[PDB]
Amino acid sequence: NLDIIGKRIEKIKQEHETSWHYDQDHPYKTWAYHGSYETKSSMVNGVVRLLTKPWDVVPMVTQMAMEKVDTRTQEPKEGTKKLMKITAEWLWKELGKKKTPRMCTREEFTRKVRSNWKSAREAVEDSRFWELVDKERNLHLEGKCETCVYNMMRAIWYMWLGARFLEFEALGFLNEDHWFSRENSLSGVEGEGLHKLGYILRDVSKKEGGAMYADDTAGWDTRITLEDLKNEEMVTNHMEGEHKKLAEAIFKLTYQNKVVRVQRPTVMDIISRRDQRGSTYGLNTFTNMEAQLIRQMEGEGVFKSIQHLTVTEEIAVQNWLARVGRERLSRMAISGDDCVVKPLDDRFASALTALNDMGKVRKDIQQWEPSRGWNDWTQVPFCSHHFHELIMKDGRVLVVPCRNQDELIGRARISQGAGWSLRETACLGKSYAQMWSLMYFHRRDLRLAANAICSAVPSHWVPTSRTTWSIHAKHEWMTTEDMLTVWNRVWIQENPWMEDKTPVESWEEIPYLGKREDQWCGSLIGLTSRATWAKNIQTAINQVRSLIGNEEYTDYMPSMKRF
Ligand SMILES: COc1cccc(S(=O)(=O)NC(=O)c2cc(-c3ccc(C#CCO)s3)c(OC)cc2OC)c1
Ligand SMILES: [Zn+2]
Ligand SMILES: [Zn+2]
Numbered sequence: 001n002l003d004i005i006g007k008r009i010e011k012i013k014q015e016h017e018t019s020w021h022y023d024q025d026h027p028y029k030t031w032a033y034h035g036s037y038e039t040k041s042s043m044v045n046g047v048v049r050l051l052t053k054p055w056d057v058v059p060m061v062t063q064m065a066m067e068k069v070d071t072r073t074q075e076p077k078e079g080t081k082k083l084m085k086i087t088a089e090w091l092w093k094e095l096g097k098k099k100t101p102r103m104c105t106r107e108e109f110t111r112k113v114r115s116n117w118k119s120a121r122e123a124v125e126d127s128r129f130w131e132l133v134d135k136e137r138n139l140h141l142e143g144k145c146e147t148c149v150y151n152m153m154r155a156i157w158y159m160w161l162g163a164r165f166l167e168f169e170a171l172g173f174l175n176e177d178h179w180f181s182r183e184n185s186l187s188g189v190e191g192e193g194l195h196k197l198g199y200i201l202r203d204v205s206k207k208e209g210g211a212m213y214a215d216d217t218a219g220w221d222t223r224i225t226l227e228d229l230k231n232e233e234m235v236t237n238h239m240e241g242e243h244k245k246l247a248e249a250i251f252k253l254t255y256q257n258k259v260v261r262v263q264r265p266t267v268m269d270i271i272s273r274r275d276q277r278g279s280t281y282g283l284n285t286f287t288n289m290e291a292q293l294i295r296q297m298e299g300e301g302v303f304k305s306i307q308h309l310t311v312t313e314e315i316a317v318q319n320w321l322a323r324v325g326r327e328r329l330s331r332m333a334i335s336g337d338d339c340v341v342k343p344l345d346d347r348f349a350s351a352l353t354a355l356n357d358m359g360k361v362r363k364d365i366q367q368w369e370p371s372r373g374w375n376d377w378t379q380v381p382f383c384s385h386h387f388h389e390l391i392m393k394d395g396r397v398l399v400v401p402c403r404n405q406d407e408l409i410g411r412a413r414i415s416q417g418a419g420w421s422l423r424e425t426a427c428l429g430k431s432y433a434q435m436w437s438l439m440y441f442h443r444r445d446l447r448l449a450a451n452a453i454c455s456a457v458p459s460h461w462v463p464t465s466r467t468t469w470s471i472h473a474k475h476e477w478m479t480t481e482d483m484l485t486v487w488n489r490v491w492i493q494e495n496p497w498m499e500d501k502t503p504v505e506s507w508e509e510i511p512y513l514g515k516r517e518d519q520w521c522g523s524l525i526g527l528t529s530r531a532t533w534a535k536n537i538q539t540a541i542n543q544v545r546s547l548i549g550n551e552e553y554t555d556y557m558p559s560m561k562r563f
Pocket of ligand 1: 195474
């Protein structure tokens, strides 16, 4: 307890000696309280809103712009703990077969910050920051920590740049070298991209099995146990030398014994705990892959009880893993806490003992109620999307991503942060428009609104900011290259599920969902407000061009049949 975290608490105490006190009436019960000290934007994107007038009266769009971490998860039973250890050891070996753990560099970290002190850009350029990094790194090498403290604000657990670099240096390889790519992990989807997720679910559906299960865990990061953190730590067994010690330091000193600061009505509390995850992707994917294989084992009756595992059962588990483990991994699509599983049959639905005992209690369902599966891959939820099968005029088949259209419009109408110029606002509007042209072209209102935004924003202005922080986004729309060329590269040329590589010559060859399907997924097609908007779109485009000024514009509307 106090030995590993003491040095971090001491520094905070000395830094705030004047204010430092032990508040006897604090609201902590699961977190260890140490002391407290005294202490001290969802903006609308006007370009997008002006070009999406019918949605000004749609509440689901307009409303978008307008301490549940102090819980304890019971220690799993001895059998669950054996199941997790056997599975985690097996899974790290499968993952390491074709990959080599390595340290990530200052140059790679600098390359990241230079894309995505008052800024990380400022600190990374200053030699003194790297000297502070050196002092922290040398403490880690002898099993000590002084500055790796989380700053809470779901709750986002921030960290100082140097603590982030040390974490990235030791464990960045998991993401940088694609350990959870579908090729390497079989269940993983890291590096795939939203436009491949649909084809992966259709491939999973081709397997013989029961329904497709896609159970959400209620607050996954709070359900990460010490047992999970210890099982994830086993990746150090595949490392050597300096790398091995640095990674063991991140796990033991910053993950298994964290020091967190949080503002309370204004005091700053200094709390600690051995479990939970600060809200990485790779480690959540690993542990979810492990938890879902164990559920598959239970469904298949590999073991009878979680309370304890029989001498023979432990062998049966190891035999199951060597015999069918990889095939069972391939029945899954897992991205952190997001999962889709197509098990051997429907016994999985009621295989809930190990799942609940691991702490991965399902959301919006009673603890012992059997899961309700999906009978069609096109109905399955995955990473806030569902997927449609679209047949092109030429017979080729696209598998496209989709979500309720109000969510898409509501999000594009939001600008995050302060001090944006009209040019930066217009350029973020352009990033959303090009993202829609690439991913959601099949939605009538979005292809129209996207062409309107691209017609209203100066043609050579470069898309800015980001439309999403999703790890599934590859940002192909962040360019001034013609979007028909980008569409052909993404959907035809580089698409492995597309055998015929004939390019598309116009947007008119690119299909939409059926009109009724489009309305079902939130289209305003058929409404009077929408017909007026579509008919008078040049007027809305001109209003924005007039606000931006005397610039060079292109009319993208005639790429559509009606225009
Ligand atoms: C996570 O929680 C959030 C909460 C609020 C806001 C937001 S957000 O606006 O920042 N993002 C999303 O809502 C969102 C976006 C995507 C993608 C879009 C385009 C992609 C591609 C490609 C090809 O290169 S990927 C995605 O894809 C699965 C998943 C997403 O959400 C789960 C996120
Ligand atoms: Zn540290
Ligand atoms: Zn849809």
